[PDB]
Structures are given as structure tokens and as C-alpha cells.
């Protein structure tokens, strides 16, 4: 008597971004011929928790026809994860904004001075023609740093395109980190770079467990308990971790090896309980275990009783996770037949993932996310950059960036020489010179 | 690798071997681990059974876990507190599902 | 339906799993039977608590089938859901052989181990 | 951006790994505090560790700050060349408040060794 379709055509499954920015989504040329859908187009689309995004629609010629690409920014204003379902909608009644109320995010300007609007919110709206909904929390990337603001009124309300006749308003309290749902400093799987296929398996195993746990009690079927990430240091084995966390919405809980040995006898056993419990406790959840081979070496490299028990309490709790429901254990290890072999057995570490080094075009990647932040000069080729360091790793990588930015601030605080100012980070370039610097130096 | 006075007289008398089952008890443990299943007309657990050899009773536990998994997710895309029994019981895992399970090398 | 064999699971049971078990099967049952029912990936066990006629009779396309009341408790019944028994065990036929007969004594008949030396 | 966190100083006996450590402290008004592996080593179990993070917490609170470890292979030698528990954790120790100095402002870490394999 009172229902509708189920099926919609403007249902669509959430997926990543290949344009990064903040206001562009994208969707398969058929599924917006099907919706009668124009490149360029505003679109109001609908989330979880009666959330709602205005976005501009492009074409992509890799988007499966049911899926929608769309940044972490618009997630989040959304409240899905990938995998979730949104709808869309065309929204072509959009005016542009006579004015617009916005808030910094607390935590994401602290030790930032200077004037905000100027360096960060002018150059991302500028002759931009962004659309924005009342409620949007946006990042904006600069000066080494990202930053985020929250729009708080628009006018018209409750959406409108920032245009060059917006004004744009910011005083006010800014806005408490705590009381929002954003991004900023959490790792997602746009912060990895140059292994898609391992990713996407590990994507694969924990998809039911954490995003879908209530399954488990319908079925007798078995997940995979613990995933072994094997690789070299620094090729971003805690990266993967923590981004599956945060992207699935799952708790995350570290142990790391070193940190359980550094313990007397007997508080080593009880950290590692510890652990499994709290993560049994706000399942779903993963554990993982950096540095395992620092806690469960094979029984030949053991010298000690102490050594032997913490091993055995590993091998317990494992034991154990069946009857902890909804909880994955990660861990890796750079000497995978190092660790000993039990743990490899049958409901412990069922799954093992080689995470090795980036390719050519993975380090090209892996340069364009630590270089997000910066102003890099018209000279910078990071295709070459990523050409000659064959055999590096993200973490070599990562700290070649910072190698070079801050060779680019010695360079300047020569000429200026407590708290810093936005704007002459803003504006200061790292250049050609900078990374070639940093490339030639030996010591690391 | 066990100490050798655990086999005296009166302690640990008896032994027995349990090997790695040729390609007809893989057949049998196969049949085991699906007998809750929906399976379709195209599973040929023969086909598994004769591939998979060396791999133990845990290996094909296993391998029919994943299937029965990759087939719930690729018909929980089309669907998306507590599971319906309508839904679950006709779900059918394919031959498909059981060869991309062949197919994955992280186990 | 006995109870633990059945957390988890939502929906119409019988339509599930009871009309595919007996269509057109003409099982024989009896009053107090615990009987088993595999699908959905997983097995559901139920408990015949009346026949008419009773104690026994012939489950038919006619016969209407009741599923009313409180589940019956797993702790109150024998039965076998969940547990492992040797049709759980393939290709070892010879060796499970052998351990039958090494324990059958000791276990299913030890009196008679204390008459004899 | 993240600056060096450690800076590692290889070279035989004698060659001003320390004095290196002290002038670049005085040079940049720093704060330095010398952590000598045998003195550490010579303490009790737990006290060597107390020890450790005693002079990570008082870099910490006077900072910018240079922690010097001299004869850092007296503490830190690889996992073969150990032949105790209490020494194993002791390495843990460092390693653990190595990882900790991300939180720790404007400290670095220069450590010596003549054995850098
Ligand atoms: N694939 C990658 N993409 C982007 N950054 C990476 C990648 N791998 C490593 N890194 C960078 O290297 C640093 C350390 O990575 P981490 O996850 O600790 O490595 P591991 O755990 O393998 O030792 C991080 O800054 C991380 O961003
Ligand atoms: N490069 C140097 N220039 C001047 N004196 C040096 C130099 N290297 C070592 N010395 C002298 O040798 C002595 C010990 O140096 P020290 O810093 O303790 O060496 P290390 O720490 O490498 O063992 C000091 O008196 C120091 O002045
Ligand atoms: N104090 C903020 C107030 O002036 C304001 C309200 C609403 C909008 Br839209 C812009 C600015
Ligand atoms: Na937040
Ligand atoms: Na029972």
C-alpha cells in the first residue's frame, strides 16, 4: 500500500578515489547515461546517518558500472566506508553563495600562525566553482602540512557553489577535532602507495569479519584468523595495518615486539592477555604485532626459559581468538623463517601476504603521497626521482621527502632566520636542487 | 623429536601414522567439509580432489571456507543484525568460487 | 527445534529447512526422534514431540507438520550437533581402523580389566 | 616533515666520537646527557632499565636536548651475541624508548660503536 522500488538504478557501491579532490566524484559513462548524468553536472548524493554531499560528477573509463568513486573527505561527510552503498541524485538547483560561514578543526591548526583564510581557504576555492553543503568537513594540504575546516552556514542554505563574489566568514571558536567524524593524520589506503594486488587481497580477507561480523553467527563457515605480513623494514607493513583499521571502522590495537620484551618475567605474559582481551572487548578489531620475530623466534634462536613462555603465550592466545569473535591478528615480520613455525598452523597465522619493494612506478606513488603537503617547483620531476632509486622502500622514500624539505628550509632560514608563520611556509618551493641534494647525500 | 623415554614399555606403546591423504581420501574430506553447502550443478569436487595433491585435511578445510566466503561476497554486493535463513540456504557456492580458491597463493 | 542449534539463524525455519527434508520423502518417524538437517551452511537439529497417529508414523504430502512452542533444550537431549564423530573424518580408513580396535576394550568394556591380568 | 631522530657515529676507539657529540651539544646550546653502556650494564636487573629511561624522561624536560650513548654495543649487540634474558631486555628497553622519542620534542640521539656489525 505504501512502498516503492528496491532495486534503484542510483544506488551505488562506494570505491576509491583516482581523482583525489575534495568535490569530484566519479561514475561509469553508462551508469550516467542510465541517470541522464553530464560531466560537470551537481550531485546531491546520500549516505548513512541521513548525511548528505554535493559533488560534481565526471566520467572514469575503469568505474564499474554499480560503483562510485569518491575521495575520503566525502566519505567521511557521508559516513560510509568503501563498500558501502550511496545513492545519487542530480542537484542542478545550486546557487552561487552570497556567503559562507567556515571553522578551522582545533587540532589541525595548532602551531600554525598567520592568516589561514589567505594561505589555505583563497587558493582552494579560487575561480574553483566548488559546491559545498552546510556540515562538510573539507581538507585543504599546504605548507607541509594538511589542514581542516568545517562549513558551519551557506546562504543559500544548505548548499550553494563558492564563487568569486562569496564572501567567505571565519571568526568564531574553532571547532573541537573530538566532536567531528574526519581524517586528518589517520592513514587510509590513499596513504599507500605501490602494492595494489597485496591490498586488495587483504582487502578480500577481512571485508565479512569487520564489516559484516554478524554473519558468523548465521554460519559455520571459517574466516581467516591471522594474517602474516612478510617484507623487507619499511615497505609499510604497520601502513596496511593501520589503513585496514581505519578504513573497515575497525578497533586497532599494537603490540609492539620490543616493547612486550622489555618487560619483567611475568608482565610480558600478562600485556600480550592484556591485548587480546581489550580487543575482544570492542571488537570488531584487529590486533597487530610489529616486530614479531622479537617474540616468537623458532626455538632454536631462544636461549631462555622466559623467551620460550612468551612464545607459548602467543601460541595460547592465538588459540584462543576462535572463541574472540570478529578479531583479526595481523604481524609482520622482515625474517619470516625466523619466527617459529607453530604459528603458522591451522587457525593461528593462516594467511601470509609478501609485501616486497615498489616497483619504478610504486615509488613514483609512494613520492606523490609524502609530497601531498608541499609546494614542489615547476622543476621537480618525481618520475625521475622514482627511476633512479631502484631498491628503495616507502621508508627510504618518505625520508628522502624530509631530507629534501627541510634542505629547502635551511636554504631559507638563512635569509629570514616561536611560533611559525603560514604564510612563509606556504610559499616557500622545494626544488630540483633540494631532492638532488638530498639524493646525493650518503649517510643514510 | 620427542624425547625417546616417552616410547618405554608401559608409556607411549603404540604408534600410528597419520599421512597425507591420497586423492581419493581428499575426494572424501572434500565431501565432509561441503555437506552444509549449497553447491551447483558445476562443482566437480573430483576436479579438486585430483588437483590438490600433498595438501593435507586442514588445506581442504580451508579451501572450502574461502569458497563458501568468495561466493557470500560477491552476492553480499547485490544485498548489502541477525542473517536470513531464506537467504543463506539458496546461496550456492560454484565451481567458480571453488577456483578462485584454487587460485589464491597467500595461504 | 533444539535450541543451540539454531542461535544466529532469523527467518522461517520450517519453509527452510523442514519442507525440503520431507518433500515427497516419506520418512518414517517417531515421538522423542532428535533428527538433523543440514543447509546455509550449517546444521539445524529439531525434536519430534508428537505423531498422530502416535508413536510412529509416515511424514506424507498430506501431513501437516507443527512447529509451535518452546525450543527444546540441547543440555535436556542426546545428541550429536556440533560433535565430532568419525563420518567427520576422510582418508584414514586403516589407521582409524587400527585405534578403534587398540581402545575398544579399555573403554567400552574396562570391567574387564579387573578379571583379567 | 620529520627530522633525524638518531644519528649512529661508527669508527675505532679514540677517533672523538664523544668529543664530536659534546661540541656539536655546546655549539647549538643543547642539553647533553652521557649514557655510558658499561656503567648501565654494570647495574642490576632493573635498575640498568630504570636507568635508560631515567635519562630519555630528563632529555625530555630540558630539551633541545642530545643524548649521547657511548659504547653503545655494551647494551645493544645483536640477538646472537646475547647470552641472558635480563641483557635481551635490556636492548628491548632501548629499542622501546627509541620509538618514543617521536613524542619527545627537539631531542636527538647520537650513539658510538666501534663494532657497527
Ligand atoms: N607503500 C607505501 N606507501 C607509502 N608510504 C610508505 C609505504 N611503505 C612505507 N611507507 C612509509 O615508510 C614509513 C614506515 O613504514 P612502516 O609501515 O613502519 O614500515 P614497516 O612496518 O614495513 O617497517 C612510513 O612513513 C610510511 O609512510
Ligand atoms: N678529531 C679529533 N680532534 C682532536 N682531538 C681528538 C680527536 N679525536 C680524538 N681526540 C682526542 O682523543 C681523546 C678521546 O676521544 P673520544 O672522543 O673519547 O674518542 P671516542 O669517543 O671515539 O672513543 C680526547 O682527548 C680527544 O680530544
Ligand atoms: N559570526 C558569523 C556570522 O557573521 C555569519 C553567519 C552566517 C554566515 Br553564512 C556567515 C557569517
Ligand atoms: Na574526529
Ligand atoms: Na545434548
Redesign the pocket.
Known amino acids: 500500500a505504501i512502498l516503492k522500488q528496491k532495486n534503484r538504478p542510483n544506488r551505488l557501491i562506494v570505491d576509491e578515489a583516482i581523482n583525489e579532490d575534495n568535490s569530484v566524484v566519479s561514475l561509469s559513462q553508462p551508469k550516467m547515461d542510465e541517470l541522464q548524468l553530464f560531466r560537470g553536472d551537481t550531485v546531491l548524493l546520500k549516505g548513512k546517518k541521513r548525511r548528505e554531499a554535493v559533488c560534481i560528477v565526471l566520467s572514469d573509463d575503469t568505474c564499474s558500472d554499480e560503483k562510485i568513486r569518491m575521495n575520503r573527505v566525502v566519505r567521511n561527510n557521508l559516513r560510509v566506508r568503501l563498500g558501502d552503498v550511496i545513492s545519487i541524485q542530480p542537484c542542478p538547483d545550486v546557487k552561487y553563495g552570497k556567503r559562507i560561514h567556515v571553522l578551522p578543526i582545533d587540532d589541525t591548526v595548532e602551531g600554525i600562525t598567520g592568516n589561514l583564510f589567505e594561505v589555505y581557504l583563497k587558493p582552494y576555492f579560487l575561480e574553483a566553482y566548488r559546491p559545498i553543503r552546510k556540515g562538510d568537513i573539507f581538507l585543504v594540504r599546504g605548507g607541509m602540512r594538511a589542514v581542516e575546516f568545517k562549513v558551519v552556514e551557506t546562504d543559500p542554505s544548505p548548499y550553494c557553489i563558492v564563487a568569486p563574489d562569496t564572501v567567505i566568514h571565519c571568526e568564531g571558536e574553532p571547532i573541537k577535532r573530538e566532536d567531528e567524524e574526519e581524517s586528518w593524520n589517520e592513514?587510509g589506503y590513499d596513504?599507500?602507495?605501490?602494492?595494489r594486488k597485496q591490498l586488495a587481497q587483504i582487502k578480500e580477507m577481512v571485508e565479512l569479519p569487520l564489516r559484516h561480523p554478524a554473519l558468523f553467527k548465521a554460519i559455520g563457515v571459517k574466516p581467516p584468523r591471522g594474517i602474516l605480513?612478510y617484507?623487507?623494514?619499511?615497505?609499510?607493513?604497520?601502513?596496511?595495518?593501520?589503513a585496514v583499521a581505519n578504513e573497515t571502522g575497525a578497533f586497532f590495537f599494537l603490540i609492539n615486539g620490543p616493547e612486550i620484551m622489555s618487560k619483567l618475567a611475568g608482565e610480558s605474559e600478562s600485556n600480550l592477555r592484556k591485548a587480546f582481551e581489550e580487543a575482544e572487548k570492542n571488537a570488531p578489531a584487529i590486533i597487530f604485532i610489529?616486530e614479531l620475530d622479537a617474540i616468537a623466534p623458532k626455538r632454536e634462536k631462544t636461549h631462555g626459559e622466559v623467551e620460550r613462555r612468551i612464545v607459548s603465550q602467543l601460541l595460547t592466545l592465538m588459540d584462543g581468538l576462535k572463541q574472540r569473535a570478529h578479531v583479526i591478528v595481523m604481524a609482520?615480520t622482515?625474517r619470516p623463517n625466523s619466527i617459529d613455525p607453530a604459528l603458522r598452523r591451522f587457525g593461528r597465522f593462516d594467511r601470509e601476504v609478501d609485501?616486497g619493494i615498489?616497483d619504478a612506478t610504486?615509488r613514483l606513488?609512494?613520492l606523490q603521497?609524502?609530497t601531498k603537503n608541499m609546494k614542489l617547483a615547476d622543476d621537480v620531476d618525481l618520475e625521475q626521482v622514482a627511476n633512479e632509486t631502484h631498491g628503495h622502500?616507502?621508508?627510504?622514500?618518505?625520508?628522502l621527502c624530509s631530507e629534501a624539505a627541510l634542505q629547502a628550509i635551511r636554504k631559507k632560514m638563512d635569509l629570514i632566520d616561536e611560533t611559525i608563520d603560514a604564510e612563509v611556509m606556504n610559499s616557500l618551493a622545494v626544488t630540483m636542487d633540494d631532492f638532488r641534494w638530498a639524493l646525493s647525500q650518503s649517510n643514510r
Open positions: 592513514v596513504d599507500i602507495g605501490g602494492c605480513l617484507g623487507p623494514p619499511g615497505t609499510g607493513k604497520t601502513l596496511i595495518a593501520r610489529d609482520a622482515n609485501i615498489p610504486g606513488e609512494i603521497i609524502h622502500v616507502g621508508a627510504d622514500l618518505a625520508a
